[PDB]
Amino acid sequence: RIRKYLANYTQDPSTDNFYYWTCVVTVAYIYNLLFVIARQVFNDLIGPSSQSLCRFYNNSTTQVECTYNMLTNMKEMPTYSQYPDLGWSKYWHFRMLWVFFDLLMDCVYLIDTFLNYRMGYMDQGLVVREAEKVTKAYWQSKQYRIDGISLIPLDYILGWPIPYINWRGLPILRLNRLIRYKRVRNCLERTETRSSMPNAFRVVVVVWYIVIIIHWNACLYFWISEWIGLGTDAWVYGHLNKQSLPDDITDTLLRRYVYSFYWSTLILTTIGEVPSPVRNIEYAFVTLDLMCGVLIFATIVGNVGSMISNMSAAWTEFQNKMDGIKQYMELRKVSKQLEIRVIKWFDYLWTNKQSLSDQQVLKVLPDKLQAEIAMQVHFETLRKVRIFQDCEAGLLAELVLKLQLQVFSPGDFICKKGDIGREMYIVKRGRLQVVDDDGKKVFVTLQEGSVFGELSILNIAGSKNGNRRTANVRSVGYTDLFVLSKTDLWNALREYPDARKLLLAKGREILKKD
Amino acid sequence: RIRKYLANYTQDPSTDNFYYWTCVVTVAYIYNLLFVIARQVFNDLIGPSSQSLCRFYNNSTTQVECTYNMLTNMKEMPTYSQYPDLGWSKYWHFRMLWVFFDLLMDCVYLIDTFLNYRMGYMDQGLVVREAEKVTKAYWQSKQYRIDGISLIPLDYILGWPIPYINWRGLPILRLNRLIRYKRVRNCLERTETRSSMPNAFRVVVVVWYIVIIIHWNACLYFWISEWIGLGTDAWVYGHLNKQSLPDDITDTLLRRYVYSFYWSTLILTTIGEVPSPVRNIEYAFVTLDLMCGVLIFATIVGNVGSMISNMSAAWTEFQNKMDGIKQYMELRKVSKQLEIRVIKWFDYLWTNKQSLSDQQVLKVLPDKLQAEIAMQVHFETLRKVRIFQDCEAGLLAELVLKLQLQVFSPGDFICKKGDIGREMYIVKRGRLQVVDDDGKKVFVTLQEGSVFGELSILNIAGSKNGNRRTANVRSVGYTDLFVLSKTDLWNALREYPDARKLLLAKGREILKKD
């Protein structure tokens, strides 16, 4: 049953279902961040627990409950009288909605605590899936302290307005759900690997951080502006501030959050077009908040500057290389036709997205993975060279591991008649031809997969010709040859005696064949 | 006794007690910075030496001593009449507190002068601890000039308000204690080595510099605003500035320092929401101060941008390498299963915090320290290979100096049956197994510390097999093998003739044993 399915369960963290679970815990953490500091500071989000009483002149000035016309053009801020049961007779649907979402995110935290309990730790490469072993790995570690502080249910006791003991409600006691930050950091990292664009996702995560810090500073500004007193200064929120409440503007909860977000956006990006402070504690808060805004603006400028300089590094290294050899050509007074040819060759080098390098796979992959990336490209092409047909595959492994890439220009010759031939040519993505001394084509136009110079690698002393090419091979287009020198085949043939005997036999066969 | 303990004392600078002494001299320097410029400019810190006399209308307007109600809503600034003894009858406890802290930091400067006297200079690696030699090293150097200018006691003569000669007191003569900056630079550097995070400590030291420059500019602004005249312009401090003294704000010493700090924070971070200047000398000061604020803001932006770009260099070099070989794979049209395997291998490369490199310890350590970091890892594992048991340790030194690290993938074979075997495998943090041609396990599952291929390194010509593997070795998890080729053991065995005889003897023994 499902009880023994739970008793014999152990989660390993590398699947995609656990990654979607880390997305769910990231959603619950973002909820806990935003709406716990907003329900602490603003407190009309869970329904107003105090009736707003304005001073209204009709007859005489009486004290009556504020309508939306009494909050426009205020001469003084409305005073509050609490309800008997603190907004519970009329905002219970709001509070049951907030209690339902708090219980949903605490159920998400409970299921993440159980997945921390049956969590497969990686021992020696493989993951442990035995239940007692991951249980003792949990209890031997100190994950249960962070799982226990993040699940104290005391917000359900002392976080809602209780009318019987006249408790005003304290929703800052749900800040202990915010120390599950390792799961959100794991979800952001494992999304940053598999993303389509890592630099743009780093910038989107940085502006999500910026919106969260601006929101927390908005709640901090309205808490300080409520603790000092609303409408007592020209800096705090209220009627005496003419930016927060202008002429025909109602004072509502949306106006409070909208002006506090505008204040923290103008302070933390160092624009500062808000009213200047009046008292001393407002000067201390605005000075500390503007120094933090200078550091936040420098963080934004540094992250966007590193995002720009990371994605335009290959282009400026290309410009460094292009300017270096253009400086080398204009220092040495070369003809201009070669300069047209090399700049059109760099245009081909950009429009193929290549860099004349094998060095990235020569460096950063281990030699087994280098062997697999060698075999899944050139092995099926290098089985069809008609001398490597009946041979051992290990020699082919050492040969495909030692292939070299050369790119040619259109109209440019590879090797002329009467040249010291010591290389074998394997054509990839090109078209070669043999030409009868810049006249017509002789016999064949070598397409992709074909081979030229397989006779001048086996080193037969004087059968028909030793090592001369006896061909004028021309590239009609941009051709990407794959060349294998005589030294590499004779090293890999020095490691194989019987294959040396067999390749000498097949070479004498194909050389006495013509 | 303690007098001959002082006569035979010499301090070497590399201990931790001298580092805590440099922290004490840094504390005394920070005191001298902040409170010498604050006691010069503000001057109510040592007690007001002049009675504030407001114009108060009761009857008639009379001139009376200002209360805290007379400094709110001022129509003109209060004029000052000095005391007979200049605040000494009522602020002597404040001045004895300031004199006690000045004598405490000058005692710290005297003990640092004596530790400069008996300071052990480093001659040839070792430190000199002979007393006459460090005494002549002191007097031959010019440390005594900087120690003599930083200890003129003339602030105790002409830095306090003397009533008998009507001296107002000049606490800017204690600025000569500020040229002991080499000790503070040494303490900041030697804290920056041993810190937990060098980039964050560089940023914390930069914002300590920012708070100190903002404080010195606050004292400069209030000195210029006091020299021009308080309350004469709308730019200077006073009643005519409506930002400094608003409606219900008392003019106190805390209001002066708080508004001057707010002014220098808004100017030196180029926000500039302070009142615009009126006269010409205020325009000259605000123009120079805003150009210095542009350079300070560019310094903050440059330091935080270099802090960001230094700590995210390994990640973007990983992304350069990953994008380079992904470009190499998608240029060459490879199957997708190998692409899943290489991206999960880079996920393992990040989650082990490795980079497939020995090159950092191959480069930056000297060869003795490379030998020690070699011997304290692989020597105890390489003593247990059962052929290197009875051998000389120097050959083992040249062998552990030539070990190579290879990482494998789970399910991927190391070497199949019928392969050219020329390497010896030493397992670290992995689990290998021999499999009977992708069937069951044959005999053993090779755990950590075990060795495979120690028979195919000694090169015995035709006893049972020359150099074939005759095993299918599979990694079940991510395995970090340590491999030693035949070329490295035969180079280190070419340097040892008798060890070559002994390893041939033990190799023939273990090869005729089976």
Residue numbers in the entry:
A (entry chain A), B (entry chain D): 104 to 161, 165 to 620
What sentences appear in the manuscript?
CNG channels open when bound with cGMP and conduct Na+ and Ca2+ ions into photoreceptor cells. The gating ring transmits cGMP binding/unbinding-triggered conformational changes in the CNBD to the TMD, where a cavity gate formed by two hydrophobic residues in S6 opens and closes. Cryo-EM structures of the Caenorhabditis elegans TAX-4 CNG channel carrying the analogous mutation, R421W, show that most apo channels are open. R421W disrupts this interaction, destabilizes the closed state, and stabilizes the open state.
Surprisingly, consensus 3D refinement of apo TAX-4_R421W cryo-EM single particles revealed substantial heterogeneity and suggested the existence of channels in both closed and open states. Further processing with an S6-gating ring-CNBD mask and focused 3D classification showed that indeed apo TAX-4_R421W existed not only in the closed state but also in an open state; the two structures were determined at 3.2 and 3.1 Å resolution, respectively, with C4 symmetry. The closed-state structures of apo TAX-4_R421W and apo WT TAX-4 are identical, with an r.m.s.d. of 0.50 Å when all visible amino acids are compared. In the closed state, R421 forms a salt bridge with E298 in S4 of a neighboring subunit; it also forms a hydrogen bond with Q425 in the A’ α helix and a cation-π interaction with W456 in the B’ α helix of the gating ring of the same subunit. The R421-E298 salt bridge is the only interaction between R421 and the transmembrane segments. The R421W mutation alters these interactions. In particular, the closed state is greatly destabilized due to the disruption of the R421-E298 intersubunit salt bridge and the resulting repulsion between the π system of W421 and the negative charge of E298. The intrasubunit R421-Q425 hydrogen bond and R421-W456 cation-π interaction observed in the closed state are also disrupted by the R421W mutation, albeit W421 still makes van der Waals contacts with Q425 and W456.
